[PDB]
Nucleic acid binder design. Structure first.
Lengths: 137, 97, 76, 116, 174
RNA sequence: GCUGGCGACCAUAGCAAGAGUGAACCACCUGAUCCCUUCCCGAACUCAGAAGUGAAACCUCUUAGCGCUGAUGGUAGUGUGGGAUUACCCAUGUGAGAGUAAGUCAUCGCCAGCU
RNA sequence: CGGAGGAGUACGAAGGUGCGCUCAGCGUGGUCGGAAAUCACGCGUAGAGUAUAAAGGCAAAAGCGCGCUUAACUGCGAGAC
């Protein structure tokens, strides 16, 4: 389970998720990649599950690059507790996803195998994705 | 010679955010040509022609001819903007060569 | 229970006279915690880094010097 | 190396800035192992009002590098400044210690009649 | 030395290094002696012993050196004396160096203790000699526990080879 | 045209490398008597000077090598009116940051000395 | 009853003034002495410090030393926040 080793502050504001992904939308490590076409949140458990599925499909014959990291903590109230009395406790970590964000890249694997693995992985994710390949510009 | 792009002029009333969005709804692409010894020129291209040209690897190394009316410019592709989620081309830079 | 919930009263800092306005001697121009602005001609500095006018005239802001400091002055 | 001059200008900076802030006519003096120089400069700091140094034809044939020449240069600058029409000046030692030839020049100017 | 260096060794070094300008000829600038007698906070008399020792050794009043920065592992902290030092220039360093070269190396227990190595890489040479005798000072009587002193020579010689040349011309054992 | 002092301006001006100047000036330089100095030292500050040198240091010139400056076009954001509710679209006004083409080895004032 | 930290003091010098000075880190060499004491020399650098929490500041340093001192005065006070 991915998580920051250390943080400056325990709890952060909710914020708003707007805009597109102008940074991180270009294939840079592998030859083929999967990128999100819709915005949402990605949790550490989802990242782990997708990685495990892809590795099992590709049989550890190539390298997998993970380009999303969960660094935003999310709190929840203990349950059967009334409103007020301070902010809740940290329960899990997420990464904000904007359209165009590349999630995984694969290097050193046949294209059909990579597409099969990505198709398997996409069924575990809470947003719509698409497949891209390296281009000159 | 191998690559010829037909272009129209892009006057000052066709520049800005609204005009560019109208062009892309009409399925054209704005582009800019700059380079040594002359003043930059703004043109517009066709999306299908641009996509077909980019489909081949040799296009990024050769000298291409952009024709707008009677005149003609010999250029090379220098930069390119793509839509982050759809990958459709949106703008192009050409350096005179 | 919580351990937070404290704050201090506001202090109302900031620029009091903007460029192009006329002043009389003694008028306060800038309230600042540190020297964000520095005193130019006909401007004095207080013990809490307040900038005030020492002559009648028109306020002007500029950037000058080798460190690129921001200066305010009064022209007669 | 070069640190002597850098230190000297570092020491001169504070007095020069304070004189500029006060807005007075300045009497800036320079010293070298062979000669002495003195200038009277307007408050804005861009125009020279008067000057005097051992390089003048009167003194250039002498020792030019000791206390006796400093006194004569002080008298000369006092006379020229008084003729030019300046009376109240602030003395600028330019990072040198107020001593020896510097002090002699200042005393000769004061005796000549510049009040400071 | 002194006039010996000025009249003789200048031309000798000039011909040895074949350097055109006379200002390029190396010369020795200063001689620095140091005793860093740590843990003085526990006793406080070894420090006055050390200053008296160097005042005997060299014809100058030594200056005590305080600490900078505090180390908890040792007993040392910021504003107290940790060591002391003397510097020598001009005639004093020439006389001290002459006494060194003449009478120090015979009185030490083991010869060959000094080397032509241990050059800083810019012409300055540091050597630490144990024992405060090998000088014309009072014997074990009237002195506290014996102390060892560091001595650094600083010269205008640019590089190690020129430093070695000047040292050899002056006549250090090595 | 070279040298010194004082300013304007504060990288298109800076840093780094390479080369050059002793007639004058400047600098290194000699000495420690007298004035003055080092929590020790004529190293620094100071005085008395002219045997040496342009080595160092400072000034001057060459170089895009780092640095710095930097368009046009597009993109993001956004005031008003309208249409929608993962927060976007239309009309109208405005418009970055980053990146690209390109540029840069500054430009002026006052006084004094020399050729 | 949102997210994080401090205060209920200290100082006759840690106040005034004149004069003077630059930190931190690293690499080298050098008795005990080492990762790290003190000495000497170079290199890139404000990353040190500012009685105390944080922020805004700090080259005429607002950081650091030395001599003499009591303006840590009395009567006020144009004009502003």
């Amino acid at each position: 389970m991915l998580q920051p080793k250390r943080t400056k502050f325990r709890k952060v504001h909710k914020g708003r998720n707007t805009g597109l992904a102008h940074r991180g939308s270009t294939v840079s490590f592998g030859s083929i990649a999967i990128k999100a076409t819709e915005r949402g949140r990605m949790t550490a458990r989802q990242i782990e599950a997708a990685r495990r599925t892809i590795s099992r499909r590709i049989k550890r014959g190539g390298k997998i690059f993970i380009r999303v990291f969960p660094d935003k903590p999310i709190t929840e109230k203990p349950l059967e507790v009334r409103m007020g009395n301070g902010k809740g406790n940290v329960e899990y970590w997420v990464c904000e996803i904007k359209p165009g964000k590349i999630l995984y890249e694969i290097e050193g694997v046949n294209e059909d195998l990579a597409r099969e693995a990505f198709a398997l992985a996409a069924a575990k994710l809470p947003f719509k994705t698409t497949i891209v390949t390296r281009t000159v510009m | 010679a191998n690559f010829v792009l037909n272009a129209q002029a892009r006057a000052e009333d066709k520049q800005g955010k609204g005009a560019s969005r109208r062009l892309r709804r009409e399925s054209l692409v704005p582009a800019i040509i700059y380079g040594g010894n002359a003043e930059p020129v703004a043109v517009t291209l066709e999306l299908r022609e641009l996509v077909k040209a980019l489909e081949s690897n040799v296009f990024f190394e050769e000298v291409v001819e952009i024709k707008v009316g009677d005149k003609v410019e010999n250029v090379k592709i220098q930069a390119l903007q793509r839509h982050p989620a759809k990958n459709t081309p949106m703008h192009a830079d050409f350096k005179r060569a | 229970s919580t351990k937070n919930g404290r704050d201090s009263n506001p202090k109302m800092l900031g620029v009091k006279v903007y460029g192009g306005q006329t002043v009389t001697a003694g008028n306060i121009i800038v309230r600042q915690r540190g020297t964000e602005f520095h005193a130019g001609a006909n401007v004095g500095m207080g013990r809490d880094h307040t900038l005030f006018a020492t002559a009648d005239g028109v306020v002007k802001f500029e950037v000058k010097g080798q460190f690129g400091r921001r200066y305010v002055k009064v022209e007669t | 190396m070069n640190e002597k001059k850098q230190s000297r200008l570092r020491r001169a900076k504070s007095t020069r800035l304070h004189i500029r802030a006060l807005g007075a006519t300045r009497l800036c003096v320079n010293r070298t192992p062979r000669h002495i120089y003195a200038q009277v400069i307007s408050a804005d700091g861009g125009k020279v009002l008067a000057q005097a140094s051992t390089l003048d034809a009167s003194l250039r044939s002498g020792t030019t590098g000791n206390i006796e020449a400093a006194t004569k240069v002080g008298a000369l600058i006092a006379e020229r400044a008084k003729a030019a029409g300046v009376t109240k000046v602030a003395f600028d030692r330019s990072g040198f210690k107020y001593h020896g030839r510097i002090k002699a020049l200042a005393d000769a100017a004061r005796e000549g009649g510049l009040e400071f | 030395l002194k006039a010996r260096y000025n009249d003789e060794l200048k031309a000798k070094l000039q011909e040895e290094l074949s350097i055109k300008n006379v200002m390029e000829i190396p010369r020795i600038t200063k001689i620095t002696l140091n005793m860093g007698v740590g843990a003085a906070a526990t006793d406080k008399k070894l420090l006055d012993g050390a200053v008296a020792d160097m005042q005997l050794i060299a014809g100058q009043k030594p200056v005590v050196t305080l600490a900078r920065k505090s180390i908890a592992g040792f007993k040392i902290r910021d504003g107290w004396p940790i060591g002391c030092k003397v510097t020598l220039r001009g005639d004093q360093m020439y006389e001290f160096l002459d006494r060194l070269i003449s009478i120090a190396i015979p009185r030490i227990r083991d010869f060959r203790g000094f080397s032509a190595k241990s050059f800083d890489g810019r012409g300055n040479y540091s050597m630490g000699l144990k024992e405060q005798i090998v000088f014309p000072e009072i014997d074990f009587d009237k002195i506290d526990r014996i102390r060892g002193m560091d001595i650094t020579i600083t010269t205008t010689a640019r590089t190690d080879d020129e430093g070695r040349a000047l040292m050899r011309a002056f006549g250090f054992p090595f």
